[PDB]
Amino acid sequence: APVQKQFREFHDRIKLAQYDENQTLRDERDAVLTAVREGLKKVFADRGEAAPTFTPFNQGSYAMNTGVKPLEGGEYDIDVGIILNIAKDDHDPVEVKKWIRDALKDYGNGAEIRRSCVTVFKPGYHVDLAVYADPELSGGTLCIAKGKENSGDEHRLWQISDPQGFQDRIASKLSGDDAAQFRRCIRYLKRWRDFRFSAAPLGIGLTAAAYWWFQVSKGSGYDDRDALEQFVQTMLDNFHDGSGPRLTVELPVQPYNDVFEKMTGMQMESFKSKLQALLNALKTAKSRLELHDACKALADHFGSEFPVPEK
Ligand SMILES: Nc1ncnc2c1ncn2[C@@H]1O[C@H](COP(=O)(O)OP(=O)(O)OP(=O)(O)O)[C@@H](O)[C@H]1O
Ligand SMILES: Nc1ncnc2c1ncn2[C@@H]1O[C@H](COP(=O)(O)OP(=O)(O)OP(=O)(O)O)[C@@H](O)[C@H]1O
Ligand SMILES: [Mg+2]
Ligand SMILES: [Mg+2]
């Protein structure tokens, strides 16, 4: 059955406005940044040292306009980059993340140092602060602080990064109504992720996969069901058998890492099976005569906000 109207209704329910269109997200972002700015002055004052400063930039889905609302009991995810005014060769990357952790000591319940960011957890959302060294002071590269406290020397590094280049690639892939379909299809699959996975890499992973493999589908209108079917099939086509089935997807800018690499062999096998089931549901929605049956098939994978008309 034709299901484009219901996909567009679903899109309206799941979409979360980007930073430039969302005063609440800007305010919450700016609240944590001020907490970092004020905290650094105190931490360093208390050591009788000059505080480092930083330049923030928007990152992640709320920067790229690929954001979704969480399900009840899920969290918003505010991604921000902070570029510290330091030479990467003067500081251990873990020690620079400790500055940020210490700055936020007294903010909500404080912050957690993770492999790739410093996270502040609040009721119903967290703020992931990616921590970078200054490119000019560091020899011209923008490097992110990798590693956890008490991590071995091999598991901490200043890793070459290109967050602006990634955002530019996502923004420039398509334009106008074609780009709108691309963003809708990323959002649909994020809600699928949230509904069908009890999964952290799937956000970036699905976005990078869409960059490589998304194709517009339009005739008498945009055909989101068909664009998803082609995209899901293409993702499945790109699994390879190592030990078991894996999908390896390079980031399309430095450092060209596999954005799915954190997933275990079993998580990848489960991922593939859930993509197969989604593909069948997309095919079923096309072939079903009754709109009710087509939409029920989709709601089984996209969840309760996918509208299922009566009859
Ligand atoms: N290369 C990256 N650039 C920017 N931000 C990143 C990068 N990798 C991860 N992040 C951010 O860090 C968050 C958490 O990923 P991270 O790798 O730090 O997890 P973790 O909790 O330490 O687990 P693990 O150590 O097993 O990977 C992501 O949601 C994202 O916002
Ligand atoms: N594994 C990774 N490799 C490279 N860059 C990463 C990785 N994980 C995160 N990032 C970077 O950090 C940003 C924020 O990470 P996060 O996992 O929150 O994804 P996202 O694009 O914001 O999607 P979501 O809607 O799921 O939060 C990504 O958009 C990307 O720029
Ligand atoms: Mg995010
Ligand atoms: Mg995040």
DSSP, res 154: G
Instruction: Report residue 132: phi and psi, to 5°.
Output: -120, 150
φ and ψ at residue 84, rounded to 5 degrees: -75, 150
Domain end (from 161, 196, 227): 161
Rounded distance, CA 156 to CA 228, Å? 38
The SS3 call for residue 159 is strand
Question: Residue 262 corresponds to which tokens in the numbers above?
Answer: 């954190």
Cα Rg of the chain, angstroms: 21
Which residue in the block uniquely carries the two structure tokens 């009840």? 72
Pocket probe for ligand 2: among 19, 159, 167, 204, the residue whose CB has the most ligand atoms within 8 Å is 204
**184 plus 157 within the same structural domain:** no
What b-and-e string marks burial along 104-140, b requiring 16 or more CB atoms within 10 Å of the CB?
beebeeebebeebbbbbebeebbbbbbbbbbeeebee
User: Is the CA virtual torsion 302, 304, 306, 309 positive or negative?
Assistant: positive
Residue 3 is assigned to a structural domain of this protein:
no
Q: CB-side exposure of 10: number of CA atoms within 13 Å?
A: 29
Are 30 and 135 part of one and the same domain? yes
User: Is residue 278 included in any domain, yes or no?
Assistant: yes
Domain boundary among 161, 193, 209: 161
Residue having the nearest C-alpha atom to atom 9 of ligand 1? 116
Residue 84 sits in a domain whose CATH number is 3.30.460.90
**DSSP-derived 3-state class of residue 258:** strand
Cα dihedral 217→220→224→225 (10° resolution): -100
* C-alpha to C-alpha distance for 200 and 303, rounded to whole angstroms: 19
10 Å CB burial of residue 162 (0-12, 13-18, 19+) is middle
On whether 114 is known to bind a ligand per the annotation, the reply is yes
**Which residue is associated with the tokens 């699928």?**
192
8 Å CB contact between 192 and 11: no
Q: What is the DSSP letter of 281?
A: H
Q: Are 299 and 10 in contact (CB under 8 A)?
A: no
Shared domain check, 139 and 31: yes
Please answer whether residues 189 and 181 qualify as being in contact, where contact means their C-beta atoms are separated by less than 8 angstroms.
no
Residue 176: domain span = 166-302
Dihedral angle at the C-alpha atoms of 146, 152, 154, 159, nearest 10 degrees?
10
Do residues 62 and 25 make contact, with C-beta atoms less than 8 angstroms apart?
Answer: yes
For residue 251, the ligand 1 atom closest to its alpha carbon is 1
Closest-CA residue, ligand 2 atom 3, reads: 259
List the beta bridge partners of residue 160. 143
Beta-bridge partner residues of 245 = 241
The Cα 291–Cα 3 span in angstroms is 7
Resolution of the PDB structure in angstroms: 1.7
170 in Cβ contact with 157 (< 8 Å):
no
Maximum separation of any 2 CA atoms in the chain, in Å: 74
In a domain, 311, yes or no: no
DSSP line for 93-157: HHHHHHHHHHHTTTSTT-EEE-SS-EEEEETTEEEEEEEEE-TTTTTS--EEEE--TT--GGG-E
